[PDB]
Design a protein around this ligand. Structure first.
Ligand SMILES: O=P(O)(O)OC[C@H]1O[C@H](OP(=O)(O)OP(=O)(O)O)[C@H](O)[C@@H]1O
Ligand SMILES: O=P(O)(O)OC[C@H]1O[C@H](OP(=O)(O)OP(=O)(O)O)[C@H](O)[C@@H]1O
Ligand SMILES: Nc1c(C(=O)O)n[nH]c1C(=O)O
Ligand SMILES: Nc1c(C(=O)O)n[nH]c1C(=O)O
Ligand SMILES: [K+]
Ligand SMILES: [K+]
Ligand SMILES: [Mg+2]
Ligand SMILES: [Mg+2]
Lengths: 332, 332
C-alpha cells in the first residue's frame, strides 16, 4: 500500500518587519493555491534503501535526508517517495517546505504517526524566516504569521538575524496571527522570465536592503493587517485589490525584490497594472511566479494568452485558493 | 422559566487607524475578562410590559428599546430583564454593547431563536467604531478587528468618519482579523479617579486629535499585529508586556486619551511603570478602568492595596481572561 499526499503551493505577498528597531522581525502574508500542486506517493522500500524520484536534485537530496532523519526518529521503515507532480523549485511557490511537510506527513501516516506539521517543520530546519508554507500545509487559506521576537542583542547588529532563510539563525517556525478562508475568487498565475538567485548573491543583496527604514516596516504591517487581511475576511474584492497593488508597487522590500529581478518581472507587473482585465498583480518572493486577480477572468485569459504567444511570459493558468492544506488517501 | 446569561467585560488596548490617508479606519485590539462580569435573567413579562432593573438609567432605556425592537422583529413576548450584576457604565468595560448582546441573546433563547451576535449588534446600532465587545461576546479571548473600509470621499473630509461611536456614520460592525485564546495569565484591574466624558466634550476632543499622523497609524498597526498579537499567540509574557507598555506610553491616540484624563490616570500609569511588581499597565479606552500584568501577583496585590488605602485608586481586583464569551443556562 501507499500514502498518496496532495498539497497546494504557497504564494507570498510580502515579508513585513525588517528594520533595526522592531520588537519582532519577518512576518509573512501568504495564501495556498491548487496549481501548481504537489502529488506524491510514499511506500515502504523493500530493500530498506531510501529512494526519491520526480524532483530536482536539490529537493531530492533534502527529501532523502528528511526520510532518513524521520526513519530514525519514528523507528520506521526505509521509504520510497515517487513525486508524481512536483512544485517548481525556487520559483516563489514555497516548494521545499511544502514538499518536505507533505512527504514527512505521508511517511508519518505510513509509520502510524500523525506529526504536528509545525514541529515537523522545526525538525527539518524550516521556518527561520517564513511560517507561510508551514501554516498553509496545516490549514490552507490566507495567513499572516507573527515572525520572530528579536533578542536583546538584535539592535547592536541587526544583520545577524535579518537574513534569507538559508543563512538565518536557528529558531522555531512562526505561528499564524491571522488565518482565514480565502474567498471563492480565481487566481491568475504568470511564470515570468525572472532568474533563480545564488545563495551568496541573495545574502549580499539582502544585507544591501535590510535593515529597511522603521517607517517602512510599520507601513507594511499597516497594508497587510489593516488592508489585505480585513478585505480577505470581508470578501471585499476592490479593497483586497487596492491593498495588493499598494504592496506590489510601493512596498519597500517588495520594490527591492522587483528591482533585483529587473525588466523580466517589472515589465509583467507594469503590463498587469496597465491592463483593464487585471485588477491587481503581485510577485511571489523574487519569482519567477507572479499572481493576479480579476473580476474579468475571460478578458485576463486573452491578455495572458497574448503575453505568452509574444514570449513576455513563459506560461499562465487560472487556479483557486486551497482552504484545507495537505490531504492524504491510502491507495494500492 | 428564565434564561440566565453571563458575559465578560471588554478591555481595549487601542484604536489603530485614525489618519486621513489610510485604506481603513478604526481597528481595535481587546480582550475579555471575567470581572467585572454581567449576570442577567430574562423572562416573559406576564403583563406584556417590557421591564428592566439593575442598571444605570441610560443602559436601562436602551435595553428596554432593544427588547421592544426584538419583540417586533422575532414576534415574541414582552420580556423583563433583571440585571443581577451590571457591568460598570462608561468605565472602559464595553458595558453597553456587551449588555445589549447578552440580554438580546438571552431574549432570543426565550423566543426559540439563536441570533448571529454580529447581526444583532448591527440591529442595535453597535459597531460603528469598535467590533471588540461584539466579537468577544461570541468568542471571548483576545481579538483585533479590521475596522472599516474608508469610502472614496474619506480623504477630502476625514472628520466625517473619524468620530466617537455616538457620532460615527452607520456601518456594519467590523469582523475579527485576529482571534486567539488569551494565555492563563492573571489580569489586575484598577479603578482610577478618571472622569466620565460628555458626548459633545468627547466629539470636540476627538476632532482635536484625529486625523492623527499617517506614520502613527502605521506604528500602531505594527505594535498591535507585530507586537501584542504574536506574543499572545506564543504565550510570551515578556514580549506581551513590552508591546503593552509601548502602546500605553508611546501610542499616539492612547497618549491623547491619557492626557485628556490628566493626573487621575497618568499618576496610576506612572506608579505602575515605576513599581517592580507591575510588568505592564494599560488604560482601557479613557477609563476609569486601567489593567496590569505581573509575574509577581503576590507583590502587585500589596502594591494595589496600598494605592487603594492611600486613595490614589477607588478599587482593584485580580481576574482572568474569558476564552468563551457569553454563556446561558435555563433556570426556574
Ligand atoms: O517556508 P516557506 O514559506 O516556503 O518560505 C521559505 C522559502 O520560500 C522562498 O523561496 P520559494 O518560494 O521560491 O520556495 P523554494 O525556494 O522552496 O522553492 C525562500 O527563498 C525560501 O526558500
Ligand atoms: O462596542 P464596544 O467594543 O463596547 O466599544 C464601543 C464603546 O466602548 C467605549 O466606551 P466604554 O468601554 O466605556 O463602554 P460603555 O461606554 O458601553 O460602558 C466607547 O466609548 C463606546 O461607548
Ligand atoms: N520567504 C521569503 C521571502 C518572501 O516571501 O518574500 N523573501 N525571503 C524569504 C526567505 O525565506 O528568505
Ligand atoms: N472604542 C473606542 C475607543 C477605544 O477603545 O479606545 N476609543 N473610542 C472608542 C469609541 O468607540 O468611540
Ligand atoms: K490593471
Ligand atoms: K513597573
Ligand atoms: Mg527559495
Ligand atoms: Mg463609552
Amino acid at each position: 500500500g501507499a500514502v498518496r499526499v496532495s498539497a497546494p503551493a504557497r504564494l507570498s505577498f510580502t515579508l513585513i518587519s525588517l528594520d533595526g528597531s522592531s520588537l519582532r522581525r519577518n512576518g509573512i502574508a501568504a495564501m495556498a493555491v491548487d496549481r501548481p500542486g504537489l502529488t506524491a506517493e510514499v511506500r515502504e522500500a523493500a530493500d530498506g534503501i531510501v529512494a526519491v524520484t520526480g524532483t530536482a536534485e536539490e529537493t531530492a537530496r533534502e527529501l532523502a535526508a528528511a526520510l532518513e532523519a524521520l526513519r530514525k526518529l519514528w523507528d520506521g521503515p526505509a521509504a520510497r517517495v515517487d513525486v508524481l507532480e512536483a512544485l517548481p523549485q525556487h520559483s516563489g511557490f514555497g516548494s521545499k517546505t511544502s514538499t518536505l511537510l507533505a512527504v514527512g506527513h505521508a511517511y508519518g501516516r505510513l509509520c502510524g504517526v500523525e506529526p504536528d506539521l509545525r514541529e515537523l517543520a522545526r525538525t527539518l530546519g524550516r521556518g527561520r524566516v517564513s511560517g507561510a508554507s508551514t501554516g498553509l500545509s496545516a490549514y490552507g487559506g490566507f495567513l499572516v504569521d507573527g515572525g520572530h521576537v528579536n533578542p536583546p542583542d538584535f539592535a547592536e547588529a541587526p544583520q545577524k538575524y535579518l537574513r534569507p532563510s538559508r543563512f538565518a539563525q536557528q529558531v522555531a517556525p512562526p505561528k499564524p496571527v491571522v488565518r482565514l478562508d480565502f474567498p471563492d475568487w480565481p487566481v491568475l498565475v504568470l511564470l515570468t522570465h525572472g532568474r533563480h538567485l545564488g545563495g551568496q548573491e541573495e545574502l549580499e543583496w539582502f544585507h544591501s536592503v535590510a535593515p529597511i527604514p522603521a517607517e517602512e516596516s510599520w507601513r507594511t504591517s499597516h497594508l497587510v493587517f489593516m488592508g489585505l487581511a480585513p478585505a480577505v475576511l470581508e470578501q471585499d474584492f476592490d479593497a483586497f485589490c487596492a491593498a495588493v497593488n499598494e504592496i506590489t508597487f510601493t512596498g519597500h522590500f517588495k520594490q527591492a525584490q522587483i528591482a533585483f529581478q529587473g525588466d523580466a518581472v517589472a515589465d509583467v507587473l507594469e503590463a498587469g497594472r496597465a491592463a483593464p482585465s487585471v485588477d491587481a498583480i503581485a510577485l511571489s518572493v523574487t519569482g519567477p511566479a507572479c499572481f493576479a486577480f480579476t473580476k474579468r477572468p475571460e478578458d485576463a485569459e486573452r491578455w495572458a494568452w497574448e503575453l505568452k504567444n509574444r514570449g513576455l511570459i513563459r506560461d499562465f493558468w487560472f487556479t483557486r485558493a486551497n482552504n484545507q492544506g495537505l490531504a492524504t488517501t491510502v491507495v494500492s
